[PDB]
């Protein structure tokens, strides 16, 4: 499922990401834009042999079990396949443990390089929330 900008914002807001640990909704949407281009089915192989999964490109080295990442953790206690659902509940729930880790949204390189310090609330601009 490829979300719409304001569709995704609404869904994330409905799941409690707006201002979660201080990160306004715009950050979470901008993160999704530059991670998966809003596509729940996005997958991408990392250099280390891990894979990034879903709307926020959650990664198999620490966060989920994909059955093929040697010496990884499943800190969110889910199959990585669960992050490719058209229902974003597990992507959001796992992002909430990721973002609490102490690194914040810096865990996402896309957010750090493309969203951090930008007018991120442009990404929610015009949406009925
Ligand atoms: Cl839900
Ligand atoms: Pt929820
Ligand atoms: Pt939902």
From Swiss-Prot:
It comes from the Eukaryota. It catalyses: Hydrolysis of (1->4)-beta-linkages between N-acetylmuramic acid and N-acetyl-D-glucosamine residues in a peptidoglycan and between N-acetyl-D-glucosamine residues in chitodextrins. Keywords: Allergen, Antimicrobial, Bacteriolytic enzyme, Disulfide bond, Glycosidase, Hydrolase, Secreted, Signal. Substrate binds at residue 101. It is found in: Secreted. InterPro entries: Glyco_hydro_22 (IPR001916), Glyco_hydro_22_CS (IPR019799), Glyco_hydro_22_lys (IPR000974), Lysozyme-like_dom_sf (IPR023346). Its EC number is 3.2.1.17. Residues 1-129 form the C-type lysozyme domain. Belongs to the glycosyl hydrolase 22 family. Lysozymes have primarily a bacteriolytic function; those in tissues and body fluids are associated with the monocyte-macrophage system and enhance the activity of immunoagents. Has bacteriolytic activity against M.luteus. This is Lysozyme C. It comes from Gallus gallus (Chicken).
